[PDB]
mmCIF file of C-alpha atoms in Angstrom:
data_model
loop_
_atom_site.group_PDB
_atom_site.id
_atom_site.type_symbol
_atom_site.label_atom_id
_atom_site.label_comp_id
_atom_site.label_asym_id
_atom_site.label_seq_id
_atom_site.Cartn_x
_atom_site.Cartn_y
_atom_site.Cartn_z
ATOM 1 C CA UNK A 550 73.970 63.265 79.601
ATOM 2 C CA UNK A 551 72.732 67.081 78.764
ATOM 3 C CA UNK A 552 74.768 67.572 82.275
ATOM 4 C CA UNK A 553 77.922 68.177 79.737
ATOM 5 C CA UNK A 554 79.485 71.042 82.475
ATOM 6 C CA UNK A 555 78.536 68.882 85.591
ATOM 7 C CA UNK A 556 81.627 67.489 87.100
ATOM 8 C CA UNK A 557 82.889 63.582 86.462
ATOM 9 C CA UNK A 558 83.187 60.595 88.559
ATOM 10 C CA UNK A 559 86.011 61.119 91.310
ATOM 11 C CA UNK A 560 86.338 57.836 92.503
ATOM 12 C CA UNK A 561 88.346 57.880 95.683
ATOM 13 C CA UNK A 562 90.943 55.480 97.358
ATOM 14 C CA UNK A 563 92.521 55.855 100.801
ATOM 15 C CA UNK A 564 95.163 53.837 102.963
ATOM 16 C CA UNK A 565 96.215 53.639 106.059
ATOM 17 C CA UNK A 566 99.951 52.262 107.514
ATOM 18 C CA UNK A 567 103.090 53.407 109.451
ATOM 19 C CA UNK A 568 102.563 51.026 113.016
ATOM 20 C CA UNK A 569 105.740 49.407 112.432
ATOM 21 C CA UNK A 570 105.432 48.204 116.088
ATOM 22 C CA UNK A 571 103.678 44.568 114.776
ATOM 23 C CA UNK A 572 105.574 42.605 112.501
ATOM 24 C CA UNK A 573 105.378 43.657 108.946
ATOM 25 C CA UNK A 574 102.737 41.927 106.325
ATOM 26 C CA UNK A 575 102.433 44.206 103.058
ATOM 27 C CA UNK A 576 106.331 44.729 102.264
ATOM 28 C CA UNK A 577 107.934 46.153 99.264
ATOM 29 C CA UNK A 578 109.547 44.550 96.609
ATOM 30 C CA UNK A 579 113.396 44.815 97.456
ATOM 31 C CA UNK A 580 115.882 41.660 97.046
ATOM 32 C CA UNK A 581 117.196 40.313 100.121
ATOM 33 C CA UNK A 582 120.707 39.474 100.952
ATOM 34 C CA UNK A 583 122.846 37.334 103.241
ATOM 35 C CA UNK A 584 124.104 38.795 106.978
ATOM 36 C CA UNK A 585 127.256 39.481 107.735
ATOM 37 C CA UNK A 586 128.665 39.109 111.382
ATOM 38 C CA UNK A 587 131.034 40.663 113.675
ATOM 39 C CA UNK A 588 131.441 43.881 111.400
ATOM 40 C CA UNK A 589 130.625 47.347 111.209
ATOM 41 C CA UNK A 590 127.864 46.712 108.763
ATOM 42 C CA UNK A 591 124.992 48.747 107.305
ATOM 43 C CA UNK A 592 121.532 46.838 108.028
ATOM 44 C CA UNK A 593 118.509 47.138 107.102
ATOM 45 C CA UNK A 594 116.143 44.623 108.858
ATOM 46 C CA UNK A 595 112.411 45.012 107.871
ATOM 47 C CA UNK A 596 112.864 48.588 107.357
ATOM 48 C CA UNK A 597 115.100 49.507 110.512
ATOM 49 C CA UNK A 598 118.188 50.998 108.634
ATOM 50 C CA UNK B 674 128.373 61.292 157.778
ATOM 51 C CA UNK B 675 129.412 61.325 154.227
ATOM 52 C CA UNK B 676 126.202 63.074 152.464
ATOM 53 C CA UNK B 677 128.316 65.936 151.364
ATOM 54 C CA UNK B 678 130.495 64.278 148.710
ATOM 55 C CA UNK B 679 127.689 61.911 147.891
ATOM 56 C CA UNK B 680 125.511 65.116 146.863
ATOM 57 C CA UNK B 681 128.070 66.122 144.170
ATOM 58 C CA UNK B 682 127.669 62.869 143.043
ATOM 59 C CA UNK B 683 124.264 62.508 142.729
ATOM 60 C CA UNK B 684 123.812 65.849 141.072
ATOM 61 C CA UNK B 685 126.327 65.256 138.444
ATOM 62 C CA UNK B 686 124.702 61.593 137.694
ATOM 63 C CA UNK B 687 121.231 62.824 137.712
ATOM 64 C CA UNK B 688 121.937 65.843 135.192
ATOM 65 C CA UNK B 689 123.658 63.490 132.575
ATOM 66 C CA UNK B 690 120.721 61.041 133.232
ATOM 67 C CA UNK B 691 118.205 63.631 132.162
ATOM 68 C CA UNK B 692 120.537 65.156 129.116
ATOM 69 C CA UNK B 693 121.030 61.511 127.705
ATOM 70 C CA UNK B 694 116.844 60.951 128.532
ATOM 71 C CA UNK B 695 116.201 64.436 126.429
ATOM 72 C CA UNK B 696 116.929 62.890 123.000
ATOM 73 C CA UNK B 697 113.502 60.970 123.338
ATOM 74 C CA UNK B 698 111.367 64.230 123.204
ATOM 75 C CA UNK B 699 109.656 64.752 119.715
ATOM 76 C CA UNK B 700 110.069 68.751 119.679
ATOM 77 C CA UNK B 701 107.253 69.221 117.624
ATOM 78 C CA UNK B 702 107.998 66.576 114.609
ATOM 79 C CA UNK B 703 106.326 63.655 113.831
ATOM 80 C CA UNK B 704 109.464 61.371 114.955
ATOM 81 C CA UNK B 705 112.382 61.274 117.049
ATOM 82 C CA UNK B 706 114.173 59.350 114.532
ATOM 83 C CA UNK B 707 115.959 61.066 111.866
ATOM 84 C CA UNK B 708 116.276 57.842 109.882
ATOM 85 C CA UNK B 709 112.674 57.293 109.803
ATOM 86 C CA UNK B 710 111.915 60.819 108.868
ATOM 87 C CA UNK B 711 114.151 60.742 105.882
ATOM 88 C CA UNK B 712 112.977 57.609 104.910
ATOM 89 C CA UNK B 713 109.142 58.756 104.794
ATOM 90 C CA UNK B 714 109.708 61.748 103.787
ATOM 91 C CA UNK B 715 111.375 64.026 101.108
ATOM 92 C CA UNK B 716 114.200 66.523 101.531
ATOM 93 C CA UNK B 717 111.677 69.875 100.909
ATOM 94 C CA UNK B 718 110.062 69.528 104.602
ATOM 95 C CA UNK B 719 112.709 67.169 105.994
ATOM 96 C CA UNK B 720 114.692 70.221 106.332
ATOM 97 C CA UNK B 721 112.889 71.521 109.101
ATOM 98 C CA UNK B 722 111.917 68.296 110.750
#
């Protein structure tokens, strides 16, 4: 405690992602709509806009 | 007999096979997707990825 110039506790977290070649299991929180066929439509399956 | 006119052929087909094949190199980025690199990542270094 007389250490009063000495740093402070730095605790450290680290991830690691971006494979994309598996099928996803930690996704994000985004609502999901119905498909739409036979149209020039935007989509945006499991991240593959 | 007919190599001639099947050598103008071949050329032409083989170039466009190897300009359409180009668009798979990474050219020094991370991706070869744009959509992928503007999804990740923000505008300040998308720029010159």
């Amino acid at each position: 405690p007389t250490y009063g110039v000495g740093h402070q506790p730095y605790r450290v977290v680290v991830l690691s992602f971006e494979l994309l070649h598996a099928p996803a299991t930690v996704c994000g929180p985004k609502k999901s709509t119905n498909l739409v066929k036979n149209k020039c439509v935007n989509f945006n399956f499991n991240g593959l806009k | 007999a007919l190599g001639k006119l099947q050598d103008v052929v071949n050329h032409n087909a083989q170039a466009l096979n190897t300009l359409v094949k180009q668009l798979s190199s990474k050219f020094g980025a991370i991706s070869s997707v744009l959509n992928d690199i503007f999804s990740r990542l923000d505008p300040p270094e998308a720029e010159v990825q």
